[PDB]
């Protein structure tokens, strides 16, 4: 709280987290037998 | 360690599942899957150590 | 109360130096060994008759 | 000052005759030089505690540099009477600075 | 090497000079304190304690990062001045850390 002040790999990280959410939703669509 | 990350995830989910009531499935996975930053950073640090 | 210490950084800083100094003093005096006392204590009696 | 002389005299004895210290001399040698380190660590702890009680880093100095004013009286009285630096005198200095 | 490498990876992730020294100054304090606690109980420093502690450094950096990154993420997302953002945030995460 004291020393912090507000004032190229980020796009790949955004792509990876979007893919992670997509895969999480896809596997959460059914679950069940995959479990 | 694995229990600690699991507890983090479930607590983060339940925090807005109960106190906010945002949703049950469609509204909790979206707000929880964005917490992959600390887990990945810590795993990377631990294996590299 | 970890909300009171936000506007009093000096208190946290000084307890940090206190624990650092205590740890350093403990380190300087503690002896370095190999293994703890992990063995069954035994008593040996020796007699000789040439 | 006499210890270095004593070891210098210990260095020029015939072979087969060594030296040793027993009694209070051994205790003095084993104790070592720890009084200045204890004084320094007490000084640091007092500074840290004062800075904890106050907030700014400069305010504790105003209290911290009051020691000699009280120390001067103890030495003046000791020289006037003809005292000696013993444990009672030391604890007197401690309570006066407190 | 562990303590320098954790700083390196955290700098790679956060990508800013600020908000990265907090765990690298928190870790040595915990290290010295654990040494002092072990000294208090009468145990000595030997191979077993060093191995257990080089095992535990992962959970120590975990405990540091789970707080610092949570604070950084919330203050970035909320678009609010840091004071009350961090206030709300540690108030919200204190119970989870205790549990």
UniProtKB/Swiss-Prot annotation, chain A:
Gene null: resulting phenotype: Loss of susceptibility to contact-dependent growth inhibition (CDI); inhibiting cells still contact the target.
**Which ranges of this chain reside in the Cytoplasmic compartment per its record?**
1-31
Localization per record: Cell inner membrane
What switches on expression, per the entry, is described as: Positively regulated by MarA, Rob and SoxS transcriptional regulators (at protein level).
Function, as annotated, reads: AcrA-AcrB-AcrZ-TolC is a drug efflux protein complex with broad substrate specificity that uses the proton motive force to export substrates. (Microbial infection) Involved in contact-dependent growth inhibition (CDI), acts downstream of BamA, the receptor for CDI. Its role in CDI is independent of the AcrA-AcrB-TolC efflux pump complex.
Which family does the record assign? Belongs to the resistance-nodulation-cell division (RND) (TC 2.A.6) family.
Quaternary data: Homotrimer, with large domains that extend into the periplasm, interacts with AcrA and TolC. AcrA may be required to stably link this protein and TolC. Interacts with AcrZ. Part of the AcrA-AcrB-AcrZ-TolC efflux pump.
Q: What is this protein called?
A: Multidrug efflux pump subunit AcrB
Q: Which organism is it from?
A: Escherichia coli (strain K12)
Q: Which gene encodes it?
A: acrB
The portion of the full protein included here is: 494 to 542 of 1049
UniProtKB/Swiss-Prot annotation, chain D:
Record-given protein name: Multidrug efflux pump subunit AcrB
Q: Which organism is it from?
A: Escherichia coli (strain K12)
The protein's induction, as recorded, is: Positively regulated by MarA, Rob and SoxS transcriptional regulators (at protein level).
Q: Where are the transmembrane segments?
A: 34-50, 61-80, 87-98
Q: Which residues lie on this side of the membrane: Cytoplasmic?
A: 51-60
Q: Which residues form the signal peptide?
A: none
Q: How does it assemble?
A: Homotrimer, with large domains that extend into the periplasm, interacts with AcrA and TolC. AcrA may be required to stably link this protein and TolC. Interacts with AcrZ. Part of the AcrA-AcrB-AcrZ-TolC efflux pump.
Q: Supply the gene name.
A: acrB
Q: What does this protein do?
A: AcrA-AcrB-AcrZ-TolC is a drug efflux protein complex with broad substrate specificity that uses the proton motive force to export substrates. (Microbial infection) Involved in contact-dependent growth inhibition (CDI), acts downstream of BamA, the receptor for CDI. Its role in CDI is independent of the AcrA-AcrB-TolC efflux pump complex.
Q: What follows loss of this gene?
A: Loss of susceptibility to contact-dependent growth inhibition (CDI); inhibiting cells still contact the target.
Q: Where is it localised?
A: Cell inner membrane
Which residue ranges are assigned to the Periplasmic compartment in the record's topology?
A: 81-86
Query: What family name appears in the similarity comment?
Result: Belongs to the resistance-nodulation-cell division (RND) (TC 2.A.6) family.
